[PDB]
């Protein structure tokens, strides 16, 4: 089993990206073990805080470093991804010389109720995670328009086409981690 | 005098982007009146909070709406701009139908100790502010490598070449607001 440090780019109760995380976790059970990064617990980045580092920042870095891979699951806000994710990215690259992300196999996925499926957010997040040294998966693209009727309450995917698609993403990520991980 | 809602993308005590804000404010005094947007006081975006909107969010939107223009002064973190700025951007676009940024003349500037002068951050921030409906100034580019010896403690620019350059940016922004504002 490979461990995955997961960022979900939404805090709200009924987040679709949180639902997507659970769907992916269920599809991946037995092959990937997800551990959430608690990005909502991070203060806004402030370099002065390294004098007494926030526990949340220490925990963030420890989990990334102890995980085999990274997965980001992002909504799209105003045609890019949420700042809360970028704030987490930046915290874990520091202190200088201590970039936790370096060399980690990564992937990005996300969902929107709209047909664009968070594609613009995803492209930007792929670029920004590439620029902190991750080994970034590109295929298959997964710009998911959320359809509530395609999923069950337990996270099962009831729609066969959607299940095949998401399974293809999971399978690719498993293979990506095996090939490109440390 | 035109009013300007200003974002400074750093919270730390000795921030160079904060020093740059004060330099620009001094150069612009009498023509532009700066009002800081308190982006460090915003919680991480969470759509659930609109049920009881945070005061910081309400103040942010009110100041943007009541200003003639917007100025962002950004550092570069891992080849883009800080998430705290994107978080502010997203808050002020909401609720749906109530985008405070729409039609506002805007400009972006920033500084780094390195020679790249926060250019990658600035390009991304220009794009993200364009995508929320600002009327975005592009010229002159201002990718400022910070040189402490070029500035005095009162914000004066002691280096003549630097003063001419930053005055050019301020003059262009005043004209931009006059031409492109409401
Ligand atoms: C500030 C802000 C900005 C945007 C959005 C929302 C909000 C609040 N939404 C809608 C978004 O896709 C929808 O609310 C998702 O359901 C949010 O993801 P979670 O459900 O919270 O995971 C959105 N959707 C979209 O497809 N493209 C976009 O650019 C935006 N922009
Ligand atoms: C997490 C993080 C990431 C980066 C930086 C710093 C930190 C803490 N810095 C350096 C940055 O330019 C320098 O610290 C500036 O002085 C920060 O701006 P303020 O001085 O806080 O306004 C930096 N500089 C740069 O030119 N390009 C970059 O990609 C980054 N990345």
Residue numbers in the entry:
A (entry chain B), B (entry chain A): 2 to 183
Question: Please, what does the article write about this entry?
Answer:
The flavoprotein FerB (ferric reductase B, a product of gene 4071) was originally isolated from the cytoplasm of the soil bacterium Paracoccus denitrificans as one of two major enzymes able to reduce Fe(III)-ligand complexes when NADH was the electron donor. The protein is also active as a chromate reductase and, to a substantially greater extent, as a quinone reductase. There is an expanding list of bacterial flavoenzymes that display redox activities against diverse xenobiotics, such as heavy metal ions like chromate, nitro compounds, azo dyes and carbonyl compounds including quinones. These enzymes occur as homodimers or homotetramers with a non-covalently bound flavin mononucleotide (FMN) cofactor and display a bi-bi ping-pong mechanism with NAD(P)H as the presumed physiological reductant. For this, the crystal structure of holoenzyme has been solved and the effect of mutating the strategically selected residues has been analyzed by means of fluorimetric titration of free flavin by apoenzyme, enzyme kinetic assays and spectropotentiometry.
The crystals belong to the orthorhombic space group P21212 with two protein molecules in an asymmetric unit. The final model contains residues 2-182 (monomer A and B), one polyethylene glycol fragment, 451 water molecules and two flavin adenine mononucleotides. Each monomer has an α/β twisted open-sheet structure containing alpha helices on both sides of the central β-sheet in an arrangement typical for a flavodoxin-like fold. Five parallel strands in the order β2, β1, β3, β4, β5, are sandwiched between the helices α1 and α5 on one side and the helices α2, α3 and α4 on the other side. The two molecules of the asymmetric unit form a head-to-tail homodimer with two symmetrical active sites facing the opposite sides and located at the interface between the subunits. Dimerization occurs mainly via anti-parallel packing of helices α3 and α4 into a four-helix bundle. Contrary to the initial experimental hints, the present X-ray crystal data show unequivocally that FMN and not FAD is a true cofactor of FerB. The isoalloxazine ring of FMN in enzyme crystal is bent 12.8° along the N5-N10 axis. It is uncertain at present whether the initially planar oxidized isoalloxazine adopted this conformation as a result of binding to protein or whether it was only later converted to a bent semiquinone by photoelectrons generated during data collection. The FMN binding site is mainly composed of residues from the loops L1 and L3, supplemented by a few residues belonging to the adjacent subunit (Tyr46, Asp48, Arg95).
